[PDB]
Design a protein around this ligand. Structure first.
Ligand SMILES: COc1cc(C[C@@H](C)[C@H](C)Cc2ccc(O)c(OC)c2)ccc1O
Ligand SMILES: COc1cc(C[C@@H](C)[C@H](C)Cc2ccc(O)c(OC)c2)ccc1O
Lengths: 116, 115, 116, 115
């Protein structure tokens, strides 16, 4: 797939399982339209969000629900969620992996962009 | 100040200077109400965003304009900006330092919350 | 395999390819004995360093040659190398993924530990 | 000081206090020669490790005892310690701030190098 998200937990040394996330695309009128959503698997990965044909140029936002993740583990974290906002496919189609590492008071995100 | 932001550049090993950011508080209708902004100093810090009287409990967003920063350096960045969204003061006023580390395809944010 | 290393580049948004690393194990006399070595593939991964039978309890050190990586890209980085030192298999065999994200003046490392 | 270390705790959102560290310089025979040490203050900082006269070019290692830190908190950590190895002063003396962020299974280090 053209868009994959991988989430790790830095406190437990594990994938971050069952993390909900919502993906949005910026519409012509500048509002965020819902695009896709899902939750991470046992390997901390979310696959199958979109297709090469559907995933056209645009500005996309991945909102990762890190707060609910930590709350379910008994932890009151700093962030409400983690956000990744980026322009996709501006120079033709690419494949995007969004990776996030989570701690209660910190998060780090990186992107791997590969040419099909 | 109850709220300070510090921005660092991981490519150059320096404070990230002249980085613009806006701070928003979530309104009753779920919309983001702007209330403070500024740009980072020569030490990569932005102070004086708010006061303890004004900085009441609520959900706050800091939107850091990282894209403009990398553009000014001639480096093509991945992100449109970096956001930090958090609930403040859940059990009394705290001093918040939000630190952001920037790379062209990555960013990290950490909070130091003291009493 | 019981030990895998994955390295990403935060400047280029890519796996970190051809990164050399050496793995050591602490001997009875407290010296670091060479254990395994290799370099990352096109996917930024190093597999096949050891086997479940060879990878006994002990303290291990993974030394990742980040300086040569950056130098080959024209960059003079801060760190000489990135080190990960840990006790492995203290409570029975586990599988270990060591993940590193690299920038010229920063590096971050995390571990995913899974029970076979 | 030409060299300062700052340690932060990503589980608790605080300075990591009373964290022990040792600093080494690489000797002619490729061995690590200890020369400075200390533990972090209430603000998670360790200052006064060296002077500009003493802090000559060379390869330096800071070994931070993160395992003892997590043990004191009753948390089982992954790493034996966190190391930072770097060449100093390659083109004149710089002030170095090394910042380390700690989680039980992760650590990150960043350098801010100023003139
Ligand atoms: C709050 O004060 C500071 C914070 C920081 C942030 C620093 C401790 C970390 C390494 C920034 C960071 C956060 C998360 C990461 O994954 C990360 O990886 C490089 C780096 C630097 C200097 C400071 O004076
Ligand atoms: C290339 O896509 C992948 C990346 C990864 C690694 C990914 C989870 C990175 C290393 C996670 C990460 C994100 C931000 C960080 O600061 C970090 O520090 C080690 C680690 C695993 C599987 C993949 O298919």
């Amino acid at each position: 797939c053209p868009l994959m998200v991988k989430v790790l937990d830095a406190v437990r040394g594990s994938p971050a399982i069952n993390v909900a996330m919502h993906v949005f695309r910026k519409a012509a009128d500048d509002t965020w339209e819902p695009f896709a959503s899902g939750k991470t698997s046992e390997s901390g990965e979310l696959h199958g969000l979109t297709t090469e044909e559907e995933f056209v140029e645009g500005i996309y936002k991945v909102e990762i629900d890190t707060k609910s993740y930590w709350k379910a583990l008994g932890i009151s974290p700093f962030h409400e969620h983690a956000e990744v906002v980026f322009t996709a496919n501006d120079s033709g189609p690419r494949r995007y992996t969004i990776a996030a590492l989570l701690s209660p008071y910190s998060y780090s995100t990186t992107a791997v962009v590969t040419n099909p």
